[PDB]
Design an enzyme around this catalytic site. Structure first.
Site, short mmCIF file in Angstrom:
data_model
loop_
_atom_site.label_atom_id
_atom_site.label_comp_id
_atom_site.label_asym_id
_atom_site.label_seq_id
_atom_site.Cartn_x
_atom_site.Cartn_y
_atom_site.Cartn_z
N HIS A 20 -8.29 -5.09 -0.20
CA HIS A 20 -6.80 -4.23 0.41
C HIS A 20 -6.30 -5.19 2.01
CE1 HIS A 20 -3.87 -1.17 -0.15
NE2 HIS A 20 -4.46 -1.36 1.28
N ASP A 48 -8.95 -6.01 -4.13
CA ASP A 48 -8.80 -4.45 -3.72
C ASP A 48 -9.43 -3.61 -4.12
OD1 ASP A 48 -7.24 -2.10 -2.64
OD2 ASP A 48 -5.89 -3.15 -2.90
N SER A 93 0.89 -1.70 0.30
CA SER A 93 -0.20 0.33 -0.14
C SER A 93 0.49 1.36 -0.04
CB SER A 93 -0.92 0.25 1.24
OG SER A 93 -2.01 1.20 1.10
CL LIG Z 1 -1.54 2.49 3.51
#
Ligand SMILES: [Cl-]
Ligand SMILES: [Cl-]
Ligand SMILES: [Cl-]
Ligand SMILES: [Cl-]
Ligand SMILES: [Mg+2]
Ligand SMILES: [Mg+2]
Lengths: 349, 349
Positions: free
Chosen positions: B325, B296, B142
């Protein structure tokens, strides 16, 4: 009663109201004077067999339907059908927390209303005002699709055709959670005052936040990435919010949204068959076109396709639209043409 | 300075701190004493050629990496590599709004920090403390992936292998909007007081609301629909919020979240090449495995696949996970095996 110009005929377009009397709600509440707002176009034939009912969606009314979906150039053709849109209970036009004269159910005291209550209320209105006992078709989007599903399950023999657009028969846990965040952000506004505000303008910050939540979940990643909002004539993504989405939601009544959101969250036709969803959808006799939108983030194609597989004689008709769920607003070039094509084929069933 | 037990070695696991001195930020701000929190496993060899850097993600630290990703049974093998995770500036462990002794940049005065500032600071820490000038690999998820991308574009000759998991090199408009809703719900809490609260517990409602936003966007519709959270030992979807997600986010510091959220929103490696992303990614010399998670919702496969097409010699390695995610947390049975297989193949190149 509160004064909000958004919930008037000038903004939403002309409509009528009629009381169906006392309505006992499934959740145990009572609306002694249940009056509904409705708008019609076209003429009921001799056998009263050409009526099409249009339930309204969350935060919406009959307006978008008469403006974007209905016309002699569309499938919803008023030169052929008696087309009637009946506004949701609590939606701001029909009897609602902020417009009821009944003090016992005013504002924060307004009872929980289920999808089932709307459909019962609509059946009574149709019979009372027009003598309509069967519907040529029921067409609705999102919450309107929930009501459509409830119609064909609760009164299977009264509906010949069904077009649930971008919605499900049984609400999913993710959708529930999504709607909860919508509710939480309005309630988070201190101006909300536990639902006893003196004006919707006092909850402007909460309403603006809900708009931004709709920007995040109501379209698609590609909608924003490709800047599809440019066909609105706007020049920045910030403008889409500030000049279009935000003013729209900030115009609305918080209690109306919270009421209809609760209804949305608890939509479930399997209540009729002891939690057996397949048995409920198995009851359907209406020719049904299940029509999800391709990029819909919280009513995804797979959810609607899963339900379509349980409806006998039904078809899956995916609407391709980069705008996702809010493609319902007709913001894409090929949206209405897809809707018209599918509805026309359905009306020929 | 605030006392928050969440940001300690007891909760996050053992780590060290070291100052790299004065850091001038891209946005014009200055951190006179920029100190970073880092955690290591394994031993740097004589030629310093077995170092693997792990940037941290939003709301996270080195903790999840050392607990779930690192071990002798994993690709990230501390018996083979000197594995070092360096915590983001402002993340609560490194110098941050709520822990800095510098009043001029305390709390609401804390400057805007970009991804580029982190990578510059990390390079300095590696060179200063360990004499490390080249990395065997950079691995991150991420926001950690954003930093990974910035590493291989800014310092192309210093990274041999790159593994950006569930993240993009240049942030998209939808992602920006999503993160905005996270910030707004924290700012909506009156206890936040413009970032000058006396305790994170005063912003409990704001933090809880953000947790619920993560429930809606951080997994997938199927995650909730299939009740995939049951393998986490939770018994209801309400428990997932109340007993897992909410206590986690309510433990965190609002100013830390807001700082790293701003950083997240403005991640952009094309800053190095006048906004030309293809030119920026064209600089990459590291063998790169682009690894998005299948479900995601805000770092979707199509966004990452689009970027992989611009990186020479790279490969797209999609991680299949219903958890979307937050599959980064290792909540699915087949997550780590997919990560390990791909990383081992990368490390064998
Ligand atoms: Cl993040
Ligand atoms: Cl709706
Ligand atoms: Cl409308
Ligand atoms: Cl962590
Ligand atoms: Mg028209
Ligand atoms: Mg392990």
């Amino acid at each position: 009663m509160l004064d909000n110009s958004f919930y008037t005929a000038e903004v939403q377009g002309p409509y009528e109201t009629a009381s169906i009397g006392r309505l006992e709600l499934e959740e145990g509440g009572v609306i002694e004077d249940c009056w509904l707002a409705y708008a019609t176009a076209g003429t009921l034939n001799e056998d009263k067999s050409n009526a099409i009912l249009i339930p309204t969606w969350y935060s919406g009314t009959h307006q978008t339907w008469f403006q974007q979906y209905i016309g002699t150039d569309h499938a919803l053709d008023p030169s052929k059908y008696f087309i009637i849109s009946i506004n949701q209970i609590g939606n701001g036009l029909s009897v609602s927390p902020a417009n009821t004269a009944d003090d016992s159910i005013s504002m924060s005291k307004f009872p929980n209303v289920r999808i089932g209550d709307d459909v019962v209320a609509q059946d009574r209105l149709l019979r009372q005002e027009f003598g309509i006992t069967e519907l040529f078709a029921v067409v609705g989007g999102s919450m309107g699709a929930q009501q459509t599903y409830e119609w064909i399950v609760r009164f299977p023999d009264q509906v010949h055709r069904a077009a649930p657009i971008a919605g499900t028969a049984k609400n999913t846990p993710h959708d529930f959670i999504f709607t909860q965040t919508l509710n939480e952000t309005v309630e988070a506004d201190p101006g909300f005052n536990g639902g006893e505000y003196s004006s919707h303008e006092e909850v402007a910050d909460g309403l603006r936040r809900q708009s931004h939540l709709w920007a995040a979940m109501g379209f698609s990643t590609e909608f924003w990435k490709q800047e599809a909002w440019r066909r609105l004539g706007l020049e920045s993504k910030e403008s889409v919010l500030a000049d279009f989405l935000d003013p729209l939601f900030m115009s609305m009544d918080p209690n109306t949204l919270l009421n209809n959101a609760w209804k949305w969250q608890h939509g479930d036709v399997s209540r009729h068959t002891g939690g057996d969803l397949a048995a409920a959808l198995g009851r359907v006799k209406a020719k049904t076109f299940v029509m999800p939108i391709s990029e819909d983030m919280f009513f995804p194609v797979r959810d609607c396709a899963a339900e379509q597989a349980l409806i006998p004689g039904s078809e899956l008709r995916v609407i391709e639209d980069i705008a996702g769920h809010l493609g319902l607003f007709n913001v894409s070039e090929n949206y209405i043409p897809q809707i018209d094509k599918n509805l026309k084929e359905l009306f020929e069933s």
